[PDB]
Each structure stands twice: as structure tokens, then as C-alpha cells.
Design a protein around this ligand. Structure first.
Ligand SMILES: CC(=O)[C@H]1CC[C@H]2[C@@H]3CC[C@H]4C[C@H](O)CC[C@]4(C)[C@H]3C(=O)C[C@]12C
Ligand SMILES: CC(=O)[C@H]1CC[C@H]2[C@@H]3CC[C@H]4C[C@H](O)CC[C@]4(C)[C@H]3C(=O)C[C@]12C
Ligand SMILES: CC(=O)[C@H]1CC[C@H]2[C@@H]3CC[C@H]4C[C@H](O)CC[C@]4(C)[C@H]3C(=O)C[C@]12C
Ligand SMILES: CC(=O)[C@H]1CC[C@H]2[C@@H]3CC[C@H]4C[C@H](O)CC[C@]4(C)[C@H]3C(=O)C[C@]12C
Ligand SMILES: CC(=O)[C@H]1CC[C@H]2[C@@H]3CC[C@H]4C[C@H](O)CC[C@]4(C)[C@H]3C(=O)C[C@]12C
Lengths: 314, 314, 314, 314, 314
């Protein structure tokens, strides 16, 4: 007695990925097919009914169940609606949907993170005892496979049919509070190219600039201080601007750890000079022993770190 | 004589918390049940009517009271609507809502503040003598309890039913102008991580950078002045950029007072040096005992301050 | 014969004040009551008609005039609509409105300006010979009077009813082209707290920083120049950023005049040092009497200026 | 035989002028009058039909032509619609329109440019052989002439009626593809106040700051270089921030030409100083006559430049 | 047997080009003509039916196929709709559309890139066996083919009719899953004027400013370091700010390569100075012949680069 419903979804385009609001817009077509009671169409041809004329048919008792996207931010922009009325009884609901979808996202591996563009479809007013999803096949490719859209699509779609228990229907439907839900997931990874130029490389070149102070002398204090404060302030601002593209989360990202280390070498380089200025009297010949090793200690310490960093997270 | 109305609300997700406009977006379901006049349904099953077809029923005299969200910023995004028509008379109104809600917020303890995500539900056109809310049940935790949405959810929801007197309905029914209101509150706390990295740490290291001037000498005036002006201006920009994440309120926040203190230590450090620069010839051997104590007075005075700060506000 | 219309407006909240666009958002309820032909309702109770069911009544010749907000930025967000049909004949139209309103604003006294949140209500299609507004009652205080909205509400509402002559209907209604207009005004004053921290204090501490150049010496020219250019440029950036919260108006504001002075003292301080640097050899012993007096002349001129400033504008 | 249609347009307000998108919002009323078949109204008074009830009238065969704004960005925000049915036959369509309009704008004389706020009105589905505009009257002044937000309304309105030939209807209407078009233009001039405060004066004072380097000496190279690099970079950023209030046009504006000159004097001052530093020993007694003459050439050239500039462009 | 449909599209204006979201807004009219079943119109004149009155015709069984824009971001802003019903059977659907369209764009040649503003029109519910596009005519030139605001339109439109195979109808339409698709392309080139003034010229003069350091001496280290760090940091910010007008793509643009080169000359000049500072005692006469030659090597190396750069990419 539960209505077996076959569902096919074609994803036309994915766009408007917003990491801040954790939303992403999905455009495509939807198809809902179920075998109902036979009817006599005008002619043996299948009857096709478009947007407005569908209302007159449900007014004559036609059964069209409302389907609902769960992980959506607002009522999706529904396009044109059509109805395929076959003589053997099978009904086919086809329409285009453009909605702003949401999904929980973890940024602990920013910007090397992997996230899932998920579609959560599930009917309304009809539980698993009344309406059941037979199968789901997502014909996303032939368009999707173009993955130069600010992300990298890795793998095909994943379809799964599950049963969700809503407790807020228990007061009204005893033991009838489970709904069949279709879930479609597409794994994707981020493209680190944009962030290398905005934060990573500016962090590196700032570190390179910060360490030039070692190679000057016990020279004009203005010079080695200007090198210090400019690199510290520059590294300070980059630490701020690097998170403006991220939600106000608590955990630290791989970009955060990279900045803190790059912050350390920059701040240490200044204190190193500030150290030899208090020890300008204890052991001064032409150059101290700190600079003679800091000119090599700092770059090598920083160099191997980048090797550990980029070898990881990749 | 007033109709007892049982209300159940299932919150799908809370998102889009905007501290500036003091809004927050809430998605979820609503259930409204009342006992009406008995009817003879087609079959013994309860009759289920979906979005558009409900309008035809109220045209035949069916009574569906309009419910209204008070603390909303604009007309909420109403999803799919359904009606459960039982033969014994009881009617059940179930629909999905996605709205931008508002609530009075106090920012005196920024960013350690506690706020409440509130839903204020109340009917339209029907007072408490005509329509009464029997009970309210919020089955929010099942989903909501995952709070990585820029805030920290601490505790379950609190439900309360009250009666509100609108004076602008006195003109039509004297003394019968009170409306039943359902109120749903969810306490929440902020995640200070983003603010630690964006303002607090940059303020601290700037203060740390400001105090390196002490450990130099009565040295090149350019150096110790560059330390002064850069740190003062840096602290000045941070004082401004720290408030762009807040509405144009009048009272000062815990972040504000914390910056003013960090502002004091930076400006005092410059004047401290600017003082010893006025005494460069009267009593100069190597160090002004002022600097010899400022190298210890400033960190300890600032160090104990952070202990006074973080012990408070927590 | 003109229909006397009683109007009551309940303001739920005023929010979203945008000084740039000179708009402001207003949420609340509206009530329009007029005496029609008597009828016999079902029971002596008043007949209540909700959103959609109004269509059936107005199609049957019921007279429900549409009321129109003049000073609105776009088509207001109409909430739920209701109709109270009384048996004694009086008809009552009640609905909730959320609209983005506009009003001409003068910003010559930024941020000490006084502005008016105005509602200009007036019907459509019905002149004063056909429809006249009897009285207006603004039930704003019950909620509004808690002035926590980036502004301070100073006083209750002020109502004015007038007759407006539209010349573009003279070609169609000779001498019958006057419309009854309801006007609701709420005076308000601005909260200078946000601007004290963003512009005033950074301007002041910059001026304080600008004068430290005097207390150095005829010293290292780099230092007193670094004090000079940084303070001028800092004051220049603050002079620009201070108007980004204002429309691109022509007249100068009280904040503008205050900055120009703060710009003058800072730029004068640099020119002063550049002057004593031109007199570095002709008449040099230890200090130019200019510095001996500028350390007192400038603060006294600056001190009395702020006192004259804040005594005014308040 | 073509239907003569009298048109009256009342402009309520012009607001939201965006120079970047070259759009502008116009709110007001519209009146369309044509003489139809006589009718018998209830009483000799004209019959008035409001927003929804018009649909029933056009459903009964009444001829109400849809009017269309050409230079609009999206479907304009249509307010309330009314219908005046006169007994002598003349029909009057009156409604309120709030739309975001567009017009080609030339910015070669930024910020002294002159622009026109244009309304291009033209019917749909009815050509000039079917519908013709008799006359047009724009009752704009009553309100409009008060402009306080970035522009100056200078002069009255200009009305013109024309016939436009669309070639894309020849396939559907051979030789009958011309539509009557109403065009309303309002000249306006820009208010340079905002730009004087944001760029022009800051450009001037920066140029003034650039020339103080002359009055120092062949002095501490840090000072006169700090004068050089800081002024060059400051003038560089102002050239950037000056165009963010403009679309990405190709031609250079009067503000651009003004900045390029101000850019030259700033960079020339550095090269001038950098020149005398290359000649510090070959022909040195006390001062390089270059600075002694640059102190007069530079201010006079800049002063006379503003005279050539501001005598023009005004 | 498939209905041949003639389609004409008139593009009124192209506006709102957003390179970030890769969208662009298109306003214009559409004409769809097909020869249908003969009918008896009132009079021999063609019957004209406007927006609302069309619904009654399709309600009486008239066949109006829904047409669909593929490369659209959301449900487009549909204007006024009209229907021409001819007695010989031919039906004509004419309407105005304003939609936000999208197209894949390649930014490797920023800002010398050439892009295509594409419209993808294709019907719904009717395959190529039922509805076929006979021909397409784009009458765009009348208001185009000259140039647009931020881009240059070069050439007339390009028309393409194709057959698109959707695999998601195979389960419901075996071998009948091909749709006729009209595609309209407009080639366009970018206007580099805005980018020359905003990034290129500031990058060039910054390199020029960086090279003045050579012409000082083995002089005050503060000066040549101030030249060094300021130019390096300035060039660093320009590398970031130049990409804020681009999506987060992975590939590097022609603007990126130009900045990286400009980054080298600035950074190389600093290392060059940092080299001669290491040789202040080891091989010192007055100047390191490196600086004596770098004053010629760098400009010529930079000069020839600009010739290679701008000769390319054009
Ligand atoms: C012997 C030595 O190398 C000296 C030279 C500079 C000094 C530091 C300067 C900045 C100081 C800020 C605050 O006073 C805390 C302490 C702080 C980090 C100092 C020290 O630990 C001692 C340092 C490192
Ligand atoms: C004698 C001495 O060592 C000098 C060095 C720095 C000087 C201060 C700099 C800032 C000044 C601002 C305004 O002129 C009021 C006075 C003000 C606070 C100065 C003084 O108290 C005197 C100081 C402490
Ligand atoms: C003798 C003396 O005290 C010198 C020190 C600073 C100099 C001024 C610096 C700013 C200059 C701007 C422009 O070059 C015009 C001239 C301008 C006002 C200079 C002077 O007239 C001479 C001044 C006042
Ligand atoms: C002899 C003289 O006074 C020197 C001092 C500063 C020098 C200029 C500084 C900027 C240089 C940029 C690039 O290195 C090309 C060359 C460039 C324009 C120099 C010159 O032609 C020679 C100048 C004017
Ligand atoms: C021999 C010579 O001319 C010196 C002058 C400047 C020095 C360089 C400055 C920047 C340094 C950054 C980090 O310390 C790694 C090493 C780094 C590249 C230095 C060196 O290789 C040695 C240089 C080239």
C-alpha cells in the first residue's frame, strides 16, 4: 500500500559557493515517477500538462505530493512545472529548482579541506507508511565534470535512501512519525591557488624580508628596527585578513598554524636584534655570535618548517 | 468557550546570526492542532490537503486561524502548508517557516555576552477570548544541539505562554483585546576564538612591541620614536577595526575597555621615553633608572591586568 | 458625505536606520475604521475575514479602500490582512506593515543632528470630497519608548492631518483633487558614542601625538619629521574615512569642521618644526623660544577649542 | 483611427542615484487618458475600480493597454492600480510606479559632469497605428526640485514624443512595427563638495607636504626621503581610491587628470631632491640653488595650475 | 510532425557584468512564432491578448509551450506577455525578459581577455520530436555592436541551433530525450583603461620609486632601507588588491605574471642594496660598481620587459 516513488535528479549547474554563510546554490531538474491507477488520456499519446494547468487536475482529485528540500536556506526558486499523464497510470512530476542549500562544514584543514555539496530531499504530509522512495539516480555529469568553478569535484555522486524520525509528529501520528528521505552527496576539494597568492606567499616573502635584518651589522638601529616593526605589523595584518574569508569558528586552521609560525619567526627576528642591542656591551668585536648563526639558523629553521607544512595537508 | 490550541514547533537549524542588525535566521516546522466540528471524511483515513487546495476549504467555511511571528524582520518565507482534517472534528495545521527574526541584545560584555534566540508566536484577528494556546513543545535539540554556527548553545529551550494587551484593539472590543503569545527562548554564548585572533592577540603583541623600546638605550631617537608612533597608530587602527563588528551602540564593551588599557600602556610607553628624552643631558651615564624600572613595571602592571581581565568576564 | 476614517497605528519597532541611503525600516500594525451600512452578522459577534477571503467580499462590491504610504522606498511588505465587519455597519481594516521609509534629512550637525522618522499615509483613488481622515492615534510608546536602536527617541509621536493638492489630477478632477493625508512624526537625536571612539578620540590622541615633536629638541630631524608626516597622513586618512558613513553631500558637517581644525594644528606643528629647522644655524643656542612657547600655546589653543566645541553642539 | 492617449506623469522623488551601476530610482504617479465608449455609472459620478477588481473588467473585454518603461533595470515595483470610468467614455489608468531606471552617462568631466534622469515610456502590443500618445505633461516640480543627495536639479523637465521602429516585429507585423514612445528628461549637475573634501583638498595638502622637503637642507637623508616616499605612496593610494566611485570606464576623468598632475609634483619633488644628492660635493658651498629656486617654482606652478584648472571645468 | 517554431530575440541592453560571480544581466524582448490550428478571430484583424487574458486561452485548451532559459541564475524577471492569435492558425508569443545570466569564463588573459555573453534558450516538456526551433534571428545591433559600459562589444550576434541530449529522460522517453536548443552569443573584450590606472601605473611608478635607492650612495642605511621595505610592502599589497576583482580561480593571470615581475625588480633592488651593505668594508672605495651599473642595468631590464609585455597580450 505505500506509494513507491522513483526519483531522478539532473544537476544543471552548481554556483554561488559561499564559505562564510556555508551555503551553495544548486540548479537542476527533478523527476518524480510513481505508478498510479490507469486512466484514459486524450488519444493514446501521453498527456502533458504545464505550469498553470496542473492546478486544475489536482482540483479534479489528481494526487500530486509536495516534495521538500531539507538542507535549504529559503524556499527555493521553483521554475516551470510539468506533468506526464500516462495511460497505464504512471505519473511523472518534472520541474526545475534553483535553491540556496546549506550543509555543516568543517574548516580545520583550511584551505586543504574537503566538503560535501549535499541535497536532502524528502516529501511533506506523507510518511514512509504512505509514500516511499523506490530508487534515486543522479545524472549529474556531462555538465558537472567541469570543475574550474572555484572548487574541484572529486568523484561521482553518492545516493542513499533513509528513514528520518520526526518527534514533532508523535503527538499527532502515533508510530507514524518516520519519513523517507533522499540524500545526494558530491565530494569536493578546494583550490589552494587563490590563497597562496593572498596569504601564503605574502607570509613567506615577509619572513624573507624579516630575516634581512640579520645580514646588516650592529648597524644603524633605525634600519634593523624598521625591518622589525614593518615585518611584524605586516605579518599582523595578514593574520587578520586571512580569516575574513572564514566563519567565526573557534578551532584553528592549517592556515592559522602556518601564520602563527610565520608570526613567530618574524617576531623572533626582531627580538634577536633587540637582544644584541642590550648585549652591545657584553662581548662586542665587530659582530656578535648571534647574527653569525641567526643568518643561517632562522632560514633553515623556517625552510624545513615549510617542508613539513606542505608535505602535510597534501 | 475559547479554543484550546496545542502547538508544536520543530526547529531544523539556526543560522545567519548577524550581530550588527541583531537578527538571526531560524528554519523549522510548525504544528497547530484544534478540535473543530465533526465531519465525514472520504474513507476512515484523515483527509490530507496540501498547499494550494487548502484555500478551497476555507472558501467552503473551514476555519483556519492565521498565526503570526512577532519578532521577525520581514515577511517570513512560508514553505509548504498542509491540513489534517479528522472526522471527529479536530483540525491540524502544519507548515514550514524560514524567517529572519529579531531580539533585543545587550553587548556590554562583548565578546563574553550571553544572548537568547527568541521566537514570539501569537495569532492574528483572534484574541484570547476567541483563541487560546494550550501548550507549546519545542523538539529543537535533535538537530539544533550541534552549535558550531559562530555561537555556543548552552541548555535546552524554555517555553512560556503569556497574554498581551494591545491598546489599538480597544476601539473594537473594550476589555477583550488580549492575545495569547507563545514564546520560545534558546540561550546561547559566543565563541571568543575569532576575537582572540583578530583583536586581542594583535593588541597584546602590539603592547609587547611597544615595550621593546625600553630595552634599547637612550639610543637613536628615530628608533624609539618609530617604536612609539607605529605602535600608537597600530593600536589606533585596531581600536577602530575592532568595532566594525558591532552596531553603533553607545555603551562601551569589555573589548573597548580592554583596548583603552592596551592603548594606555602603548601611549604611556612613548611619553615615558619622550620624558627621558627631555633629560638626555642632565644626569646621563647609560640608563635612566626610570627605564630600568619601566622594563619591569610595564610587563608586571600589564601582566597582572590580563589576570584581572580574564578572571572577570568568565 | 465624505467618509470619516478613523486610523490607529501601532509601531512595533523602528530599525535599520541607514544614514547613507537616508532610509529607515518601520514595522507595525495599522487599523482603519469607518462607518458603513448596517448588516446582520452570523450571531451578534463581529464577522472576521482573513487574508484571502477578503477577495470574495471586495468582488461582491464591498468597499475596502487601499491606503498608501507616500514616503516609502519600495512597495511595503504587507503581512496578514484582516477585516472586521461590525453589525452596526462600521467596517474595520487591520493589517501589519513592514516598509522601508524615507525622509529628507539635513546632516549639517553630524553627529549632533536631530532627525524625524516620518510616516506619510494617504489613500488612493479617493479624494477628500470622497474620503477624509477623521483622526489619527499613534500607539508607539508601549514598545518604542525603549530607545535602544542606535538613536535616542525624544518625545512621543506628532500627528498632522492636511489636504494635499495634486496638480496631475486637475485634468481629470477639477477642484476635487485634494487628498486627506496622515503624517506621523517621531523626533530623534543621534548617539555620539560610536563616533567618539571612531573619529574624535583618534583625532584627539593624534593631536596629542602631534605635539610630542615640540618636547623632543631641535633634535634628530628624522624623529620630528616622522612625528610630522605620520600625524598629517593619519589625520588625512581619518578625514576621508569619517565621511564614509554619510551621503556624498556638499555642505560641511560639525565633524568636518572639527577635523579641519585637528588637521590645522597637526599640519601647523610640522610647519613649525620645519621653520625652526630653517633657523638651525642663525641664532641657535639650545632651543628656539618657539618650542618654549609652542609646548603651551598649542595645547591652550587646542584645549579651549574642544571646550568651545563641546559646549556648542550640545 | 489610432487611439489618442493622453499621458500625465507625477514625479514624487528621485533617489538612490548610483554612478557605478549608472542606475537611478524614480518614484511617482502615472495617468493615462483615452476617450472610449460612453458608459452609465452608478450616479453621474465616475466609477472607480481598484487593484484586484480591474482583472474582472479586462476579463469582460475592457481594453486596458499595458504600458512599459523602457530604460528600467528590472520589472518596476508596481504599487496600487486604479481605473476611472467616465460617463462620456474617457477611461483613465492611474497607478504608482517605483523603478530603478538606467541611462547612458558620460564621466569625462568627473566631478563636474552633467547628466539626465530620463524616463522612456512606450506601450506593449499596440503599435502607433493602434495606440498613439497625444500629449505628455510631467508634473515633477512640486516635489522633485529639492535634491540633497549628491546631485543638483537645475532646470525644468523636457518632454518629447517620438516613434520608434523595432525591426524584430517585421516578421510578425509587416510594415506595422512602429510604437509611440514618451521620453522625459531631467537635467542635473553634480555637487563637488564631497570630492573636494575626499580627494581634492587631500591631494593639495599632500602636494604641499611634498614641497616642505625643499625647506630642510641637503639635510638628514632619512627626512627628505621620508618626505619623498610617504608623499608618493599617499598620492598613489588617492589615485586608486578616487576611481572606486566610478565604473571601470576607459576614458580619463577631470579628477584623474588633476591627480596625475598632483602625482607629478609629488614624484618630481623626490627626483629633484634625489638629483641634488648626486651633486652634494661637486660644486657645494652652502646650498644647491636648485632648492632655493624650487621653493618658488613649485608653489607658483601649483598655484597657477589650480587657476587653469578651476577656471576651466566650471 | 514536430512543430517548427520560429524565434526572434531583441536584446535591449546588456548591463551588470559581474566578473566575480561570472554573471551578467540581459534585458530584451522575445518572439516565438509557430503555425497552429486555424481559428476564427473576432474580425479579420489579428487577435491581441495581453498578460492576464492569456490564462483564459490556455485554460480553453490552447497550446502554449513553456520556454526556458538554461544559463540563468534564478527565475528571470518576466515583464509583460502578449499573444497574437491569427485566423490561419499561427500563434505568436511575445514577452519581455530581464534575467541574470551566467556563462563559463576563462581569465588567464586578465585584463586582455575576450568573453562571450551567451543566452541559452530551450523549451520545456517538449522534445525535438514534438517541438523544433526552425530559425533564430537576433536583432541586437540597433542598441549594440558598438560597445557597452565596462566592455567592448565587437561584432554582431552569433546564432546557433543545436540538439541537446538529456540522459535523465531515457527512463521515461526512450530515444525521445533530445531537445532543440537556441544559443545566442555576443563576443566582447575588456577595457584595460581602469586597470592601467589602478594597478599597472602604480606598479610601474613603484618600480621606478624602488630604483631611486641606487642613486643615493653607500649612504644612510635608513634611507635605502626605507626605499626597500616600503616598495616591497607596497608591491605586496598591490599583488593582493589586484585580485579582489576576480573569483578564487587557480590559474595565474597576465596581471599576476606582471606583478610577480614587478615584485622581483623591487625585491631585487633591496637584495642588491643588502649585498652592497655586506661589502661596506670588503672592497670599498666610494661606491660598489654594482650600484654604479645597477642604475643602468635595472631600468633597461625593466624597460625591455614592458616592451615584451605590452607587445604581447595585445
Ligand atoms: C636580554 C634580552 O635579550 C632583552 C632585550 C629585549 C628584551 C625584551 C623587550 C620586550 C619586552 C616586553 C616586556 O617587557 C616583556 C619582556 C620583553 C620581551 C623583554 C625581555 O624579555 C628581555 C629582552 C629579550
Ligand atoms: C618634560 C617632558 O619630559 C616632556 C616629554 C613629553 C612631554 C609631553 C608630550 C605631550 C604633551 C601634550 C600637550 O602639550 C600637554 C603636555 C604633554 C602631555 C607633554 C608634557 O607633559 C611634557 C613632556 C612629558
Ligand atoms: C622660512 C620657514 O620657516 C620655512 C619653513 C617651512 C616652510 C614652508 C613649508 C611649506 C611650503 C609649501 C609651499 O612650498 C609654499 C611655501 C611653504 C609654505 C614654505 C615657506 O614659505 C617657508 C617655510 C615657512
Ligand atoms: C642625475 C640625477 O639627478 C639622477 C638622480 C635620480 C635619478 C633618477 C631616479 C629614478 C630612475 C628610475 C630608473 O632607474 C631610470 C633612471 C631614473 C629615472 C634616474 C635618472 O634618470 C637620473 C636621476 C634623475
Ligand atoms: C651575500 C649577500 O649579499 C647577502 C646580503 C643580503 C643577504 C640575504 C638577505 C635575505 C636572506 C633571507 C634569509 O636569511 C635567507 C638568506 C638571505 C637570502 C640572505 C643571503 O643569502 C645572504 C645575502 C644575499
Amino acid at each position: 500500500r505505500p506509494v513507491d516513488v522513483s526519483v531522478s535528479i539532473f544537476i544543471n549547474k552548481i554556483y554561488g559557493v559561499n564559505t562564510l554563510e556555508q551555503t551553495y546554490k544548486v540548479d537542476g531538474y527533478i523527476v518524480a515517477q510513481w505508478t498510479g491507477k490507469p486512466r484514459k488520456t486524450p488519444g493514446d499519446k501521453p498527456l502533458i500538462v504545464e505550469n498553470t494547468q496542473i492546478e486544475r487536475w489536482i482540483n479534479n482529485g489528481l494526487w500530486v505530493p509536495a516534495l521538500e528540500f531539507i538542507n535549504v536556506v529559503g524556499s527555493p526558486d521553483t521554475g516551470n512545472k510539468r506533468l506526464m499523464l500516462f495511460p497505464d497510470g504512471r505519473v511523472i512530476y518534472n520541474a526545475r529548482f534553483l535553491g540556496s542549500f546549506s550543509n555543516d562544514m568543517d574548516f580545520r584543514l583550511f584551505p586543504f579541506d574537503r566538503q560535501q555539496f549535499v541535497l536532502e530531499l524528502e516529501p511533506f504530509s506523507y510518511n514512509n507508511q504512505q509514500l516511499r522512495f523506490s530508487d534515486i539516480q543522479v545524472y549529474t555529469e556531462n555538465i558537472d565534470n567541469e570543475e574550474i568553478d572555484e572548487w574541484w569535484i572529486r568523484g561521482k555522486a553518492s545516493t542513499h535512501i533513509s528513514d528520518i524520525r520526526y518527534d514533532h509528529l508523535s503527538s499527532v501520528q502515533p508510530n507514524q512519525n518516520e519519513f523517507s528521505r533522499i540524500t545526494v552527496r558530491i565530494d569536493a576539494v578546494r583550490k589552494i591557488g587563490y590563497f597562496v597568492i593572498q596569504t601564503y606567499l605574502p607570509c613567506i616573502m615577509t619572513v624573507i624580508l624579516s630575516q634581512v635584518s640579520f645580514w646588516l651589522n650592529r648597524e644603524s638601529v633605525p634600519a634593523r628596527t624598521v625591518f622589525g616593526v614593518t615585518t611584524v605589523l605586516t605579518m599582523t595584518t595578514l593574520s587578520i585578513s586571512a580569516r575574513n574569508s572564514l566563519p567565526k569558528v573557534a578551532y584553528a586552521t592549517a592556515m592559522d598554524w602556518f601564520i602563527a609560525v610565520c608570526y613567530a619567526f618574524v617576531f623572533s627576528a626582531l627580538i634577536e636584534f633587540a637582544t644584541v642591542n642590550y648585549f652591545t656591551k657584553r662581548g662586542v668585536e665587530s659582530v656578535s655570535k648571534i647574527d653569525r648563526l641567526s643568518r643561517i639558523a632562522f632560514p633553515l629553521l623556517f625552510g624545513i618548517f615549510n617542508l613539513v607544512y606542505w608535505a602535510t595537508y597534501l
